From a paper:
SOCS2 is the substrate recruiting subunit of a CRL5 E3 complex that negatively regulates the JAK-STAT signaling by targeting substrate receptors for degradation and blocking STAT5b activation by competing with receptor pY sites. SOCS proteins share a conserved domain architecture comprising of an N-terminal extended SH2 subdomain (ESS) that functions as a bridge at the interface between the SH2 domain and the SOCS box enabling ubiquitination of captured substrate, followed by a central Src-homology 2 (SH2) domain that recognizes a phosphotyrosine (pY) containing sequence, and a C-terminal SOCS box that interacts with the adapter ElonginB-ElonginC complex (EloBC). SOCS proteins serve as substrate recognition modules that impart substrate specificity to each CRL5SOCS E3 complex. Here, we determine the co-crystal structures of SBC in complex with phosphorylated epitope peptides from its physiological targets GHR and EpoR.
SOCS2 recognizes two GHR binding sites at regions around pY487 and pY595, respectively. We therefore hypothesized that the two copies of the GHR peptides bound in the crystal structure might mimic a physiological folded conformation of GHR, presenting each of the phosphorylated sites bound simultaneously to SOCS2. To test this hypothesis, we utilized an 11-residue GHR_pY487 phosphopeptide (NIDFpYAQVSDI, KD of 2.3 μM by ITC), mixed with the GHR_pY595 peptide and SBC in equimolar 1:1:1 ratio for co-crystallization. In this crystal structure (hereafter referred to as SBC-GHR2), still two copies of the GHR_pY595 peptide, but no GHR_pY487, are observed bound, yielding a structure very similar to the previous SBC-GHR structure. However, an important observation in SBC-GHR2 compared to our other co-crystal structures was that the region of SOCS2 corresponding to residues 134–162, also called BG loop, is now fully visible in the electron density. The BG loop connects the αB and βG strand of an SH2 domain. The corresponding BG loop region in SOCS2 is either fully disordered or in an open conformation (SBC-EpoR and SBC-GHR2), suggesting that this region does not participate in substrate recognition. Nevertheless, interestingly, a similar triple-stranded β sheet structure is observed in the SBC-GHR2 structure, where the peptide B replaces the first β-sheet of the BG loop and makes backbone interactions with the BG loop and peptide A. However, the crystallography data from our follow-up experiment as described in the SBC-GHR2 structure is not consistent with this hypothesis, as two instances of the pY595 peptide were found bound despite a molar ratio of 1:1 for pY487 and pY595 peptides being present in the co-crystallization buffer.
Numbering used by the authors:
A (entry chain C): 16 to 112
B (entry chain I): -4 to 6
C (entry chain A): 30 to 137, 139 to 198
D (entry chain B): 1 to 104
E (entry chain K): -3 to 6
Write the structure that this text describes.
């Protein structure tokens, strides 16, 4: 589908565009990976160790990265508060983005 | 206006 | 480590910045920095034969270009007159830019000169592409502290932070 | 021209975009294609103020400077069950831990 | 950290 659901460790459900979610290399390997043609497939990805405040920030990066890729628009700063920077760094490395 | 190419001078 | 390995690491760090534009003419740099604030900079390939890197900066009188000299394993700014001990030189070209951005954090608005020989000023870069979320977190952490080996992080990620200690 | 929004209801958050000149009703049609509920069963909010279908997103306060990709604006969403609407409820996100001693 | 220097560009 056009959108995909990403569920955080505390149960928050984020619905983002599929092309935006493919910015993460880990998610891309999951949605565009092996499977069974006849079997049903879930359009939800569960993260058991990514909290909602971090996962919401990752989704904003998905919008930020796709918007300013192959574009003539000047790229503004991406605000990252220090209070989440380390949690965000661990999640970014885990998602390959 | 500034020239297209310049070099630094420490002052 | 030998000279080729130091230069290779310096070029890798350049590619991790996000403000390295590769092939870019003088006019294309003037267009991208025409309305940018004073201090906006970017590093591109040098059209000259004896150079490799060039800084395009927005100054008080418009966009200009500064060629980066590479002599004896160290990067230097092109200078009209120099004393060797008084010109900063580093193995990493990103370290050279980070050095001057830090120095120009205490640069003089109303107190600045209004007419005369233009003064150099470097602040924020002009990204050609959005860097990875990991690198953006690395910059935020670096702008927050320099003692990364006491942070609650796995040792694998502490090596990642050590690979790029600059704030720009 | 493009505005970037976070449509939130309970524990559900939708990351979507629209045009500043588009209307609230057209935003309810985008929600209809995601949460499978018609616009007449939806109520959109900007903080406490209820948005009406006729106003454009820019007229409601969603401009290119307050609804950027790296900082999207939040739109409240309330659903209708039977005759009366539900009260606006948005579940907060988690809290980050206190900063380490060496940080800041 | 480094002390400020007035750098002219010519
Ligand atoms: Co002067």
């Amino acid at each position: 589908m056009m959108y995909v659901k990403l569920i955080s460790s505390d149960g928050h459900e984020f619905i983002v565009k599929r092309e935006h979610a493919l910015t993460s290399g880990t998610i891309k390997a999951m949605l565009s990976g092996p499977g069974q043609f006849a079997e049903n497939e879930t359009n939800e990805v569960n993260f058991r160790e990514i909290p909602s405040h971090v996962l919401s920030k990752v989704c904003m990066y998905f919008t930020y990265k796709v918007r300013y890729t192959n574009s003539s628009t000047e790229i503004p700063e991406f605000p990252i508060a220090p209070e989440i920077a380390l949690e965000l760094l661990m999640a970014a490395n885990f998602l390959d983005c | 206006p500034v020239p297209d190419y310049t070099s630094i001078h420490i002052x | 480590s030998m000279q080729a390995a130091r230069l290779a690491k310096a070029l890798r760090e350049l590619g991790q910045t996000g403000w390295y534009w590769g092939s870019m003419t003088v006019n294309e740099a003037k267009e991208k920095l025409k309305e940018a604030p004073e201090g906006t900079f970017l590093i591109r390939d040098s059209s000259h034969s004896d150079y490799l890197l060039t800084i395009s900066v927005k100054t008080s009188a418009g966009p200009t270009n500064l060629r980066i000299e590479y002599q004896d394993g160290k990067f230097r700014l092109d200078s009209i007159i120099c004393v060797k001990s008084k010109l900063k030189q580093f193995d990493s070209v990103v370290h050279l830019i980070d050095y001057y951005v830090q120095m120009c954090k205490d640069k003089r608005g109303p107190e600045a000169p209004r007419n005369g020989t233009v003064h150099l000023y470097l602040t924020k870069p002009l990204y050609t592409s959005a860097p990875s979320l990991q690198h953006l977190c690395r910059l935020t952490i670096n702008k927050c502290t320099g003692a990364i080996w006491g942070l609650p992080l796995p040792t694998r990620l502490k090596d990642y932070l050590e690979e790029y200690k600059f704030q720009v | 021209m493009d505005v970037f929004l976070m449509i939130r209801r309970h524990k559900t958050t939708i990351f979507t975009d629209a045009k500043e000149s588009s209307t609230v009703f057209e935003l309810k049609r985008i929600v209809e294609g995601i949460l499978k509920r018609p616009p007449d069963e939806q109520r959109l909010y900007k903080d406490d103020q209820l948005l009406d279908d006729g106003k454009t997103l820019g007229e409601c306060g969603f401009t290119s400077q307050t609804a950027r990709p790296q900082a999207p604006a939040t739109v409240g969403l309330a659903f209708r069950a039977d005759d009366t609407f539900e009260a606006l409820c948005i579940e907060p996100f988690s809290s980050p831990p206190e900063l380490p001693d060496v940080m800041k």
